[PDB]
Ligand binder design. Structure first.
Ligand SMILES: *[C@@H]1O[C@H](CO)[C@@H](O[C@@H]2O[C@H](CO)[C@@H](O)[C@H](O)[C@H]2NC(C)=O)[C@H](O)[C@H]1NC(C)=O
Ligand SMILES: *[C@@H]1O[C@H](CO)[C@@H](O[C@@H]2O[C@H](CO)[C@@H](O)[C@H](O)[C@H]2NC(C)=O)[C@H](O)[C@H]1NC(C)=O
Ligand SMILES: *[C@@H]1O[C@H](CO)[C@@H](O)[C@H](O)[C@H]1NC(C)=O
Ligand SMILES: *[C@@H]1O[C@H](CO)[C@@H](O)[C@H](O)[C@H]1NC(C)=O
Ligand SMILES: *[C@@H]1O[C@H](CO)[C@@H](O)[C@H](O)[C@H]1NC(C)=O
Ligand SMILES: *[C@@H]1O[C@H](CO)[C@@H](O)[C@H](O)[C@H]1NC(C)=O
Lengths: 88, 49, 50, 98
């Protein structure tokens, strides 16, 4: 938003800042049925026993489904792959 | 020192809305000068030189 | 020389302004962050060599 | 010198080096997050995948060619020292001021 001052201008900038982060464990891809799955948009994350997929700027876990993943590859090339079940 | 490791990530769970200010000059004063009155005053002989 | 005027004050002011600006330039370019981050003791970043 | 003096700069070279090292550590260990708030960890290959995804290339391209990309980056970094040393007037801009 702008404002006027003698011989000049003043700007009020409204911005967004994150807060209250938390540790998590991550993997690059998920192996299942001999196929590799990558996230369409987001990052894989683990709470200790189960795996979810979440957007990268706000914690909102979701169940891993073929809706929000694409296969495009195999299970024997990526480094650090972790195998788990993928629903439908 | 941030705790780097090749299988760990951090993700924010809350946000904040912040407002800041920035100040910028734009224009300055407009002046004008008359030579003869400043230099020579009313001296008639001075203007000839 | 004292009869010529006040040119020396102007000279000193201009030079001082230039010097202060010289300090401000470096301060504005480099002093971006607020924390002094340190690299981890083990330098393995997936194969990249820094 | 006859009334001419040179004043020392406020920041020493060591302080500038510390600033540069801080910037490098922050960008290696966090990415672009430390410039907008608190710094958040992320493994380096995942950050590189994010950066590929920002020019129109999918993640599987990175993850399936990790070693080739790492080797190319290492060679490119290695060539810079020789490139700077060889060319004589590579640093003319800084010399002109002096
Ligand atoms: C996210 O942060 C906001 C702001 O700090 C939290 O809102 C506060 O919540 C506490 C507890 O409910 C209240 O006592 C405060 O009055 C709230 N602040 C304001 C300005 O209303 C919010 O609870 C946080 N959310 C989570 C999930 O942690
Ligand atoms: C990262 O690159 C540097 C630069 O090539 C490597 O350091 C070289 O290591 C070899 C064998 O250890 C030496 O023969 C060279 O003399 C070293 N070069 C310099 C400039 O010291 C370093 O080994 C590489 N890091 C890793 C983990 O491979
Ligand atoms: C994330 O893990 C590191 C490693 O122990 C820890 O120091 C840090 O506090 C954790 N993050 C949070 C928000 O607790
Ligand atoms: C992880 O998530 C599962 C599914 O909601 C839950 O049952 C489990 O208790 C969670 N673990 C922790 C440590 O919160
Ligand atoms: C699943 O992963 C584990 C550990 O990486 C591995 O031992 C196992 O062979 C994998 N599953 C299959 C079917 O290969
Ligand atoms: C990278 O991961 C391996 C596990 O394969 C681990 O041994 C190593 O310590 C990790 N790197 C760092 C810097 O911790």
């Amino acid at each position: 938003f702008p404002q006027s001052a003698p011989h000049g201008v003043v700007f009020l900038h409204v911005t967004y800042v994150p807060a209250q982060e938390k540790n998590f464990t991550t993997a690059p891809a998920i192996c299942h049925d001999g196929k590799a799955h990558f996230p369409r948009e987001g990052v894989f994350v683990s709470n200790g026993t189960h795996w979810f997929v979440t957007q990268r700027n706000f914690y909102e876990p979701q169940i891993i489904t073929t809706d929000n993943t694409f296969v495009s590859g195999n299970c024997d090339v990526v480094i650090g792959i972790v195998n788990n079940t993928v629903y439908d | 020192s941030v705790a780097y490791s090749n299988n760990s990530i951090a993700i924010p769970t809350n946000f904040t809305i912040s407002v800041t200010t920035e100040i910028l000059p734009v224009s300055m004063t407009k002046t004008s000068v008359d030579c003869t009155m400043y230099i020579c005053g009313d001296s008639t002989e001075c203007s000839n030189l | 020389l004292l009869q010529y005027g006040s040119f020396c004050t102007q000279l000193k002011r201009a030079l001082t302004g230039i010097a202060v600006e010289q300090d401000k330039n470096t301060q504005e370019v480099f002093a971006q962050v607020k924390q002094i981050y340190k690299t981890p003791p083990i330098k393995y970043f997936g194969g990249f060599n820094f | 010198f006859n009334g001419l003096t040179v004043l020392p700069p406020l920041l020493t070279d060591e302080m500038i080096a510390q600033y540069t090292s801080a910037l490098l550590a922050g960008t290696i260990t966090s990415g672009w997050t430390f410039g907008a708030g608190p710094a958040l960890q992320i493994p380096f290959p995942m950050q590189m995948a994010y950066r590929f995804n920002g020019i129109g290339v999918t993640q599987n391209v990175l993850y399936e060619n990790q070693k080739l990309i790492a080797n190319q980056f290492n060679s490119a970094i290695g060539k810079i020292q020789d490139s700077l040393s060889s060319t004589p007037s590579a640093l003319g801009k800084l010399q002109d001021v002096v």
